[PDB]
Subunit: 111 residues, 2 copies
Amino acid sequence: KGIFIHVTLEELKRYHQLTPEQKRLIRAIVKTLIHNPQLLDESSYLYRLLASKAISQFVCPLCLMPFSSSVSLKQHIRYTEHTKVCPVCKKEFTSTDSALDHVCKKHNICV
Amino acid sequence: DVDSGSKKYLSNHKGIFIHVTLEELKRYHQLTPEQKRLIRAIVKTLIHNPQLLDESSYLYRLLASKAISQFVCPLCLMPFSSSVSLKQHIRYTEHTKVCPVCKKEFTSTDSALDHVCKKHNICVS
Ligand SMILES: [Zn+2]
Ligand SMILES: [Zn+2]
Ligand SMILES: [Zn+2]
Ligand SMILES: [Zn+2]
């Protein structure tokens, strides 16, 4: 007896091509999260940060999207990032720059 | 009635069957729809980037330390009372040359620091 995690058919056959070791690590991680659901918001963030970090070095701390260059990351932060809520802790702000500052200072995610 | 060697687990539409005990089974269907969504999103990310499984021990030790204190060292993941005591540790006491995440090696622990910030995005003053 157990639970079904509603993954797509591709991801399901992809899943079963992983090694038992990778597979028990995965279900060990979901068990940690079931026991500690307060952990979900933040591990979701970090797993997505590290995911984006694999695509490019230049990642946005608020939206977690990879960019080609530091110039384009700067241009996105300058005109295209309007998140007023820190994705890890959900603290709300008056400014996206303040949100950027908070994520760096409190959470260690800096550009 | 059981059928252990059945191969329809491979093509089930409900998806990945994670076997679980009675306590956490009920505790799973006690989660909000939003929490269940996050669990799926993480599992999907882990499926598409399986090297994050090898970095997971670090991630959950980071989070555990961050709960004890805001001031944590990226190389050893140990909490400190203040920022002043944290950078006393980094300046004088932290000697690891290996990145706790990717296992790449360096000349100085300061090069190890810059690396963990530049390519893993975990940064400290
Ligand atoms: Zn962004
Ligand atoms: Zn926050
Ligand atoms: Zn340390
Ligand atoms: Zn590394």
